[PDB]
Ligand binder design. Sequence first.
Ligand SMILES: CN(Cc1cnc2nc(N)nc(N)c2n1)c1ccc(C(=O)N[C@@H](CCC(=O)O)C(=O)O)cc1
Ligand SMILES: CN(Cc1cnc2nc(N)nc(N)c2n1)c1ccc(C(=O)N[C@@H](CCC(=O)O)C(=O)O)cc1
Ligand SMILES: O=c1ccn([C@H]2C[C@H](O)[C@@H](COP(=O)(O)O)O2)c(=O)[nH]1
Ligand SMILES: O=c1ccn([C@H]2C[C@H](O)[C@@H](COP(=O)(O)O)O2)c(=O)[nH]1
Lengths: 264, 264
Amino acid sequence: MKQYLELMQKVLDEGTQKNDRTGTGTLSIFGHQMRFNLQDGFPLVTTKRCHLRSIIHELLWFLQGDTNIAYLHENNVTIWDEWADENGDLGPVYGKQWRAWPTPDGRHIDQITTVLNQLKNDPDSRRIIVSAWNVGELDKMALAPCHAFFQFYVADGKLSCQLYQRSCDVFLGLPFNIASYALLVHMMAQQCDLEVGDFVWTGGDTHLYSNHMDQTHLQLSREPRPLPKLIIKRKPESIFDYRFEDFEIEGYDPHPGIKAPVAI
Amino acid sequence: MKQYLELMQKVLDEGTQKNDRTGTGTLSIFGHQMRFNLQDGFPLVTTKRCHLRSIIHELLWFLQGDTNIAYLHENNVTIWDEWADENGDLGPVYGKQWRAWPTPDGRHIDQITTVLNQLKNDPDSRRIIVSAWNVGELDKMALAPCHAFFQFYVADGKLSCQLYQRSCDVFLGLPFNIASYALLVHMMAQQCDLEVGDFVWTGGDTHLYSNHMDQTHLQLSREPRPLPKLIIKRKPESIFDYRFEDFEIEGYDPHPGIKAPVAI
Ligand SMILES: CN(Cc1cnc2nc(N)nc(N)c2n1)c1ccc(C(=O)N[C@@H](CCC(=O)O)C(=O)O)cc1
Ligand SMILES: CN(Cc1cnc2nc(N)nc(N)c2n1)c1ccc(C(=O)N[C@@H](CCC(=O)O)C(=O)O)cc1
Ligand SMILES: O=c1ccn([C@H]2C[C@H](O)[C@@H](COP(=O)(O)O)O2)c(=O)[nH]1
Ligand SMILES: O=c1ccn([C@H]2C[C@H](O)[C@@H](COP(=O)(O)O)O2)c(=O)[nH]1
């Protein structure tokens, strides 16, 4: 995509060399923002083939409140294997925080449902937020949330969403992250009878790993194809009732895939 | 400031009229970002006179972990009077979350001490975050945190900071918020022997209240003057030992202040 490819070029143009947790090395910039008008098409990267099956399943898994990779495994998704323990557990990550953030007084807050109720009864609210950044539970998580905070907004009957990603692996992570959230916005809009607005992405430490340089330049030499279209074939009773089969992506003609190593 | 005035104009040109919580009505946009190179000077608005004493005392108050406006009154600061209760308390707002985030099991996390230690021991970390968005205590707060999430970053010996503000009153709140965070970066940089970098401001619902239009138009016709310079006269034993007496602003020649009512 145009915005995505411009971000890569920017990282290469004004990024600083930084050492990191993984010990790989990164080219990095701090602070960036880009907007995607969902009415223009589904933002799935076309300059390289993306695996939508894994994106959809991870999202349904998040919405279930699940943090064990069993579900992902029976659906042949292995993107989370490197961080899970002997029992397949990842700790109180995304899924748990979204559906059951623990309060100090013994309660548990379902942020997804509260957001659904806000979009319906108080769409003008400036507090329609979901956070995965639970300071008091970070030590129990296999990995600290990258996409850790997001806010919804309604205007002219359209639903918008802004995500704050503290750490961003521009080559591997980002294409997955954008499609993941664009899909959630579509599901939320269908449940609240709203049209799709903009998906605004904001990043903290936006980086490109040292071992992804050749792949990055290979992708940059490609011209983006027209954005695919998302067709939802059903309207479930709840946001938690979607199935993989309810989604149809048409007009997706990408450039060949480019393989790259993940930094654990 | 240049970029501040540009945002002010943007809200006027592209804002959507929304009936807000107060019932006053706003003109708003969703998703915006501004960068301030702190090496160029302290980002304190010159198109109108802003007062540093309220800004400085509120920040020191935050770092104390205090949530009662008693301290603020001793120093003639009244900004939190309309939201405080009969006893002067605001509930577990900013200060409490920064210094003593409560875990579900009764413990407390000192986000500021953690951040200090990360900057000093692991500067390349992509997890140097402070969050005031405690979902479990939101209902106990007099007002949900506006400037709710911030991340620090180190590169080339320079300290940068990005703040995520979910709701922003462009006229009254914004000038305060920017200067408040620019100040913290300076205190942090001094305590961690680093040079200052960029202050990145990211906003969600960025608005302009309808009863501030005349004041906005007035300010928009004033030419911005060169930015001031912040001088920290004494280096305390810790980040918690700063006093109002330690801060000085040189070369601040602003246009006269503009009065405007607050929407409670
Ligand atoms: C969201 N996710 C989890 C996750 C957790 N730790 C990480 N750690 C690093 N350093 N980078 C990541 N992107 C990453 N992301 C991902 C996303 C994509 C791939 C990945 O290998 N993607 C390939 C192949 C996808 C596939 O396996 O089918 C692609 O091009 O899409 C791995 C993990
Ligand atoms: C950061 N802060 C806290 C705070 C809490 N609730 C709010 N609620 C509303 N809607 N607006 C705010 N700006 C606001 N902000 C503020 C910021 C500015 C002023 C204020 O009135 N400031 C100057 C403004 C002077 C000027 O306009 O030039 C003054 O002394 O009157 C009050 C509280
Ligand atoms: O959805 C995701 C998950 C992870 N990452 C990346 C960010 C970092 O490259 C690495 C996590 O390392 P830390 O930032 O936690 O140190 O994984 C993404 O880009 N997207
Ligand atoms: O530091 C602050 C505190 C408050 N506000 C503003 C934002 C909104 O105008 C109002 C809070 O209202 P809600 O967004 O919670 O509705 O005060 C700021 O801009 N900055």
